[PDB]
Unconditional design. Structure first.
Lengths: 48, 397, 397, 397, 397
């Protein structure tokens, strides 16, 4: 969903897999679309 | 651009009117046009693709003409032709797609791709022909700066909006008064609720109002207006305005009283309808205003009287509503609707080729976001991009 | 009349096929037709308008024919042409509108305006051509007397009607039995309710029936039939039949039992469907009859049993319903539907120019009123007026 | 086959462009094509009918041709022509109908009738011409083994299905958890209910899911997704899974939590949307998966708290839902939709002539049955039969 | 229209380059152009005026030309020329003024007056020439549907707005918190005040924010941003929000903390500056958002500590502010600014001739009202009217 309505450089992508800190931090910090749910949702999940 | 158009109607009226049999005379006028093309092309060289996951492809031209000789058409004639068409088809597809992805702020109207920029060149203009395809028809009329116009079934003018406004509320949310609605696409549903059933209201009547401002004017609209908002006629547990808690809505529906729909244009009432349900015409408007009231029933059978006590708790919540649907309308600006595949074509090509988000369109060509902030740049780009999608659909679906 | 038609397809196929760059021969057959016109015209003078707020403008003709500069047109060629077209466009618009407002009881199927009456003259017939626009196509076939026919999406055949019929009632309205419905456009929703849940009914089954008589026969109809009437599935406070008080409806929904839909033509069953939900075809009918029953559940869990006591008060009202929607159909008479702009065009032109109410059409071209009393005169005038609207939309939207 | 097509566009473009007055040089290219036909025909004998209540009318050919002289057309010219057309019309009708009823397990994609089988003959091919009618356009592209494609507003992809699945139930049906839905046409409504309001559920959240597998892939789909399932928002008395008793459903609606819609193709996610209501694009999919949750409200006002006790009886049943509608889409296979009359035409001709049930199509051309078991044979026969219906509608509606 | 333009540059470059003495070969290219005019005119009659207090002067043409001959110009030559110019000057003036008052809802972008409508005629086009005057330059580029653009020193984008918003208040108005501002022209001043000096605020910091939405996008803006709002740095007695009483504001100024200015375009941040005072560039925006905070001083000398007690009465009111001025910018739409006389010219001609209020412009051409509701019609009329004012100022100031 991210790759389409958007446009993930081969460079980035290759990081967004290794779950790199940076490249991930960027988006969530910069952009703000989707990414900010996949993340957040997790927080909401560690509800215990 | 117009150039582009032709290229297709050429092929369509081609892959269509050229078949094993028919008389030359029915295509004589056509054949010509065709050849004329090949010529202008041959010698020239192109390049498409290069962005995102889109393949880069180069194309050259060096083709023979057409036998303007024969009387009838023999199978062999076709096959030697179809072979030439297929290269152009597979071409145009790549041409369209390549220009159907690029966006631009400054000049988001003119061509972008190396492929098309080259076409607007003068030396190719020798190909225009038969512009009866509704979209190109309007593309031109806009260049000459004149009155355009398209046709839509269940247009998509309302950005999704589902919310409420509590005009009277308190922490317990046990005696509320306000409205809740859903504006989406071509439809509006709005309900006005008063937990007290206008027990202390002047004339035992509570007034409601719902205003919707269109981002573009719609003319010639055929509209269905019906009493009641089914969407807001059932029990709900809703989040409070501040998100801190949840309230209970337990509706009981009464007929909306003194219904008045106004279709305004720049603040002026263009059309007004008083309690008229069914099919109504709104000929030119940029705003819809729905006013309706809840009137406490002056006479109540015991069963009804029991729902509306003089004092709290108010357990049955009096609700009145309206439903309005724009079946068809004309707009001077391109819009998504329930029948045309333009938005879906553009969105689909971009998604399939992993096209990166650009500077003009919202991520994913999101309709709600697009129509909410429908800037001139987004509209010019949308029209360019929709017109190309329509050119493409003449050959590739 | 047919005359009129041409005038447009002439201009369209003109403002379309005539562009900077097309080979002459792609318009040879066309150019001709065009000139032919100019000739027949020049000399004669016209009067349009002269009613309500509609302006009285005078048109006069004095034009030079069309050159033929060989081998694809040069820009200059176009502009000198477009200048001539624009006078005809602005003309026709005024011609259409002028004949799109006049009505006539006696002969409201023929030309009214001084403008058109003059066109039906013989000396003009020399223009007619390419009658492929669905509407004119049917206009002709009718003048000769034959099987006409149009195509509509969500046809507007049902005049708005929202009411109920209490088959068993009493002053307190605490044990009612009857039906309530909404017929509007192409949709019907009907619910049958029995406050007693057929406790004393033979076989513990209450029969219901809803009959809808179309004002015109529909053929080839694709219809969606679904169980339940969502519109009548929520709590309501309704006015009594005499308007003297209000009753309470608190539905609980059960599946409609022994559903039978009959599409009749002149009293004869043409199509019948027993409990078939989803998509069904009704090939020719002027009446729809929906029969369905409420059957008291023979076995009930405690929660269910609690809703249906052996004695009053009856607090949960057993309700069964059906929803029927005509997605598409063909009608031999013009009708409004959810896609065509004809009704909206006619209604809009009349509203914009403050055209006074006439002797044929209901105030505001009100659809419900029109279809409720769809007399031969209203239909002939509607068809004339719809055909003109369609001619106009080929050039002006 | 293609042959057949022509026969019509011949007549249409004929009964249309041949009117009292028009200039000859507008039909020169046409006239020809016409004559060419008469020739090829004359000297041939045909026979249609013979099945069920379908008459067996016989035909012969022996006709004179048409003048070529005359600047313009004189009334007399027409009438002597129209007389010849009417025999062909009344002919084709009988030809279409005769091949529109027969079905063949084997080659349900090839011609059937004695009438048509004879047309596919080579000596008739000399008549083909102007294949631009959307359907034939696609008939060819397929016969050549290539990529087809059609257009549909509110396609009919979902066979009617209205049911439920109880994930937690007990004899009394007083504490259920599960889903109920309605898949029909182009729409899906699904509700997830939990009588306990997730009181003992992990994170006080109950997960729901609804999967719908299309029988054919849809591309380029424009879809409306809205929260809530109005159809399942009202009180119901429903039959138990085993049909032995009835349970009570008394919903109270909460917003669906963590909504995720996935459009999959062969198990792969092609499009995914998280809580996005309004208009969304699904570019290529054969499956839709809707996942949503009911989350017990962490904060509740007294009125809300009262609906959800810590212990049974559970009298208000927490429900969350979704509504999804496919407004438009493209399919490589023919389908019924809300605008095209093909299915209705085929079904209607068969019903009118009392055509016996055959080996391919379900009784009554029932759409649900057809799409549920949409075998290759049914699709090839459906396409043949739909293409013929479209050829017929060019002349007879 | 463009026609009009020429008429002037003709006269200017005339009343300028034609003086006693100059060498002919400096005007050879000019002289010509001139004569060409006289010709096209002679034989034409005009009429201007007729509205309000505007005289109705009539004009005719019948003039001799100019010897081309002579190495140099002799006094006599001039005077016989100047006499002819003066009739055209006094003419154009009357022409401009006549079209500078009429407004049209419909086509407020097209010519109005009987005088000009006649000029757009084709037979006059033979006069166009040298379009380099910034305004006409942009008039063309727009008529062709392209990217316009203008230049303004201290543009007038903000409608006058001077108000406040109390985020915390009470009847006595002795412990308020909120903002007050002045948006006018190209400047914004905004102050955030907190009577309590954030004594009970989280982190002893009170956040403020001021958002200003432009009616048109400004690009290429050079902006001065300075801390403090001098306008709100002095003691004031202000009316309460409800107008029922007056409150006292006794500011003491502190530096704005965490200043952040965002220039957004359609919700997106295009430029952002953190605490940067002085000159900053905002390249493309339709919204300005100023966020700033008041942070209670963590360390205070006795004199300071004395101003901010732990308990009321709060007698010195902590205030932080910002001042933003748009020195220059480019806008695609015409606007009033601090250097151009267009608005003043149009407003002045209308006032002098007692022109009645029309349907488009607010009474008195009021700038605030105009920019507040800057509709497309007002903009098209404003541009037409501004372009004419600029044509007039080339000759008459
Ligand atoms: Zn529809
Ligand atoms: Zn200055």
């Amino acid at each position: 969903n991210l790759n389409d309505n958007y446009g993930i450089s081969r460079q980035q992508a290759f990081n967004l897999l290794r779950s790199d800190p940076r490249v991930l931090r960027e988006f969530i910090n910069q952009d703000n679309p989707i990414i900010r749910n996949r993340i957040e949702q997790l927080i909401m999940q560690c509800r215990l | 651009m117009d150039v582009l158009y032709s290229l297709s109607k050429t092929l369509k009226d081609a892959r269509d009117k050229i078949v094993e049999g028919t008389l030359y005379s029915n295509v004589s006028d056509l054949i010509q046009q065709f050849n004329q093309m090949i010529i202008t092309m041959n010698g020239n060289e192109f390049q498409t693709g290069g962005i995102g996951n889109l393949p880069i492809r180069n194309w050259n031209f060096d083709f023979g003409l057409l036998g303007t000789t024969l009387l009838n058409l023999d199978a062999n004639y076709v096959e030697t032709a179809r072979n030439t068409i297929d290269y152009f088809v597979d071409f145009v597809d790549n041409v369209c797609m390549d220009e159907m992805v690029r966006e631009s702020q400054r000049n988001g109207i003119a061509p972008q791709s190396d492929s098309l920029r080259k076409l607007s060149g003068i030396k190719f203009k020798r190909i225009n022909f038969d512009n009866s395809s509704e979209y190109i028809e309007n593309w031109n009329l806009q260049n000459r700066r004149q009155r355009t116009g398209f046709t839509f079934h269940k247009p998509n003018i309302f950005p999704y909006s589902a919310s409420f406004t509590l005009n009277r509320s308190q922490p317990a949310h046990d005696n509320l008064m306000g409205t809740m609605w859903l504006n989406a696409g071509s439809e509006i549903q709005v309900a006005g609720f008063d937990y007290s059933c206008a027990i202390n209201a002047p004339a035992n009547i509570q007034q409601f109002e719902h205003i919707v401002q269109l981002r573009r004017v719609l003319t010639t609209a055929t509209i269905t207006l019906l009493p009641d908002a089914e969407r807001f006629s059932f029990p709900r547990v809703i989040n409070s305005a501040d998100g801190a808690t949840t309230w209970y809505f337990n509706p009981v529906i009464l007929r909306p009283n003194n219904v008045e729909v106004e279709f305004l244009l720049n603040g002026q009432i263009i059309n007004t309808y008083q309690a008229r349900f069914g099919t109504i015409i709104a000929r030119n408007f940029d705003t819809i205003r729905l006013s309706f009231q809840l009137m406490r029933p002056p006479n109540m059978t015991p069963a009804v009287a029991a729902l509306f006590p003089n004092a709290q708790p108010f357990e049955h919540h009096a609700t009145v509503g309206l439903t309005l649907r724009i079946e068809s309308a004309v707009c001077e600006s391109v819009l998504a609707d329930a029948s045309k595949t333009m938005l879906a074509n553009v969105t689909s090509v971009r998604q399939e080729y992993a096209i990166p988000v650009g500077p003009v369109f919202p991520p994913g060509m999101n309709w709600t976001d697009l129509i909410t902030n429908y800037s001139p740049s987004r509209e010019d780009n949308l029209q360019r991009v929709f017109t190309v999608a329509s050119i493409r659909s003449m050959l590739v679906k």
